[PDB]
Amino acid sequence: TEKIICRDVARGYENVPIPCVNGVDGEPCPEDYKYISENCETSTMNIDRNITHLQHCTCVDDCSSSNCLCGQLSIRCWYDKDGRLLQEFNKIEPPLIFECNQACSCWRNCKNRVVQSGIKVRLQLYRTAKMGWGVRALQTIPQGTFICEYVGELISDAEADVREDDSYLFDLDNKDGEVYCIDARYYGNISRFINHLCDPNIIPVRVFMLHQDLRFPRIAFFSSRDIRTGEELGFDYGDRFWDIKYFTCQCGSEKCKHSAEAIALEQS
Amino acid sequence: IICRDVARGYENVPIPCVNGVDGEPCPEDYKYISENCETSTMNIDRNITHLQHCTCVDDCSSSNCLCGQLSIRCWYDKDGRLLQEFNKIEPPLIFECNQACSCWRNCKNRVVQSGIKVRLQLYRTAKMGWGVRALQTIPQGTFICEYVGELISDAEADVREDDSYLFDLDNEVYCIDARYYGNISRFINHLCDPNIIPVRVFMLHQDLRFPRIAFFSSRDIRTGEELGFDYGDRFWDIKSKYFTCQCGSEKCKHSAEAIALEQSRLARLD
Ligand SMILES: COc1cc2c(NC3CCN(C(C)C)CC3)nc(C3CCCCC3)nc2cc1OCCCN1CCCC1
Ligand SMILES: COc1cc2c(NC3CCN(C(C)C)CC3)nc(C3CCCCC3)nc2cc1OCCCN1CCCC1
Ligand SMILES: Nc1ncnc2c1ncn2[C@@H]1O[C@H](CSCC[C@H](N)C(=O)O)[C@@H](O)[C@H]1O
Ligand SMILES: Nc1ncnc2c1ncn2[C@@H]1O[C@H](CSCC[C@H](N)C(=O)O)[C@@H](O)[C@H]1O
Ligand SMILES: [Zn+2]
C-alpha cells in the first residue's frame, strides 16, 4: 500500500507543499541532498547584481502593451492574461525571457513576472516502477503553465569536469562565451527528481529576473502540452546524456528513442 | 488618500500615502525598493557553506538552536515580538535561520525575513515634512520594517552631497544610502522621545560587513502615532548648523530652544 513519507520535501520554502509518497518499495524519502528553493553558490561567481545595469521598462500599466521594454527584450512578452506561454511560443528553439525587475516602474503584480512568483501547481514526489523517484502532477495542468525552476549549485565548467556524479548537471551555454553549470546533486529542489521522457511534457526556458548577468540564466520548466492528473513530468535530457550513459531509457513511450530496443535497431 | 501603495505591491501590505497639511504630492524623487541594492561590485559573501546554521527538527523554540545561540538567545517570543529583557540601549546581533538550517521556513527565528506585517501610512507632518505613522495599535517589540537603501562604501559616503539618508554600518565601515533608492523607512523622522529601535540582523548571508537594519517597536504604539528613532548626536552635530528638531517633545534635546539654553549655560560658566 502507498504511504506519505514526507508532508513537504521543501520544508515550507515553496508556495505549496511538495509531499513524498512511495507505493512501490520500502525506500524512504530521499535525504542524500539539501533542498533549496533558490540557486546557491559554493565559490564566488561574481554575478552582476548592479541595479543600474538592469534594463527595465517605464510602464505605468500592467506591462500588457507592445511598448514594455522587458517584453521587447524577450522579442514580445510570451505570457497571456493567466501567465501561460502563448501557443506561438517556439518550443524547439525558445527565446530568453526578461521578466520585469526591481528597476521597472511597474507593480510587483504586472503581467511579466511569472517565474519570479514561484510554484503554483500541485506536485508530488513519488516512487516510479523502473526510474526511481519521479515527479507527477496532482492536478490538471494546461499547456504553457510554469511548473518549477531547475534549482541547484552554481559551478564552473572546470568544476563540473572534476565532479564524479554528473546525473544532475544542467548546462548554461551562451552565444559565444563562458560555460557554467547548475549541479542539483548536493543542493537542489523538486526539479532534481524530474526524469527523462522520450515524449516530454515540459520544456526548459532561460529566464532573467532580479539580475541580467547573461552567464547565469535561470531555468524555468513550462508545460509543453495539457498534462492530466497523476501524469509524470519529464523533459528531454538531450542526446549528450544518452551518449554518456550504463542504463537504458525506461520511459516506456511508443516513440522511445533511447530504449535498448531502439539502441539495438540504430546499431543494426 | 493620494497614493494607494508607495511600494507598488512589493510589500506584504500596501503602504498608502496621504496629505492633509499642504499641496505637496506624494514623493517621487527616489526609487522605491523592498530590498537593499548595489551600484558597485560589493560581492556579498553568499557562499552557502559559509553559513552558520542549526540542526533543529522542531520550530527553533529551544535553547539548543545554534542560530538562537549566535544571537546570545533567540530574542523572539511565540508571536515574533522581541522579549522585554532585550537590551534596547546596546542591542545584540540577530542571526535568523537561513536556507542552510534543517528547520522549516515558518520556524520561530525568521521574523525580519518574513517582512512588514503592521499597517503603516506615509503622511505629511506639520513641521518635519513626510513621516510614517501607525494605522493600527503596535505592541512593544513588534518588527515594523527594514532600513532599505543602496549599499555604498565609506569612501563613497564621503563623496555624496546629500547625507540626510545615510545609515552607518560600523563593525571597514559601509553605508545604506536611502536617498536615490530606498523603502518606507526613508521617511521615518527623528524623535527625541523615540518609539522604534534599529537592530542589526543576519538572514540569507552572514557577511558581517553588511548587517541589515530592522526597526522594532521600543514600546506600545497607539493608532495614528508617528514612528521615529533617535538619529544620534552625530546627525544633529552635522545638521544643526542648517535646521533644528521639530519633534515637539517636552524632553527634546535638539530644538532651537534646547540649543540656545546650552550655549547660554556655557557663556554663564566660561
Ligand atoms: C550525462 O549527464 C550530463 C553530463 C554532463 C557532463 N559530463 C561531464 C564529463 C566529464 N566528467 C569528468 C568527471 C571526467 C564530469 C561530467 N558535462 C557537462 C558540462 C559540459 C561543458 C563542459 C563542462 C561539463 N554537462 C553535463 C550535462 C549532463 O546532463 C545533460 C542535461 C541533462 N541533465 C540531466 C539531469 C539534469 C539535466
Ligand atoms: C548627518 O547625517 C548623517 C551623515 C553621515 C555622514 N556624513 C558625511 C560627512 C562628510 N561628507 C562629505 C561631503 C565630506 C559626506 C557626508 N557620514 C557618515 C559616514 C561616517 C563614517 C565614514 C563614512 C561616512 N554617516 C552619516 C550618518 C548620518 O546620519 C546618521 C543616522 C541618521 N540617519 C538619518 C536618516 C537615516 C539615519
Ligand atoms: N527515462 C529514464 N530511464 C531510466 N532512468 C532514468 C530515466 N530518467 C531518469 N532516470 C534516472 O534518473 C537520473 C537523473 S535525475 C532524476 C531523478 C532520479 N530518478 C532519482 O530517483 O533521484 C538518471 O541518471 C537515472 O538514474
Ligand atoms: N525631528 C526632526 N525635526 C526636523 N526635521 C526632521 C526631523 N526628523 C526628520 N527631519 C527631516 O527629515 C530628514 C531625514 S529623512 C526623514 C524623511 C523626511 N521627513 C522627508 O520628508 O523626506 C531630516 O534631514 C530633516 O529634513
Ligand atoms: Zn513594462
Ligand SMILES: [Zn+2]
Ligand atoms: Zn512589469
Ligand SMILES: [Zn+2]
Ligand atoms: Zn519591466
Ligand SMILES: [Zn+2]
Ligand atoms: Zn525513452
Ligand SMILES: [Zn+2]
Ligand atoms: Zn534552530
Ligand SMILES: [Zn+2]
Ligand atoms: Zn529555524
Ligand SMILES: [Zn+2]
Ligand atoms: Zn537556524
Ligand SMILES: [Zn+2]
Ligand atoms: Zn526633538
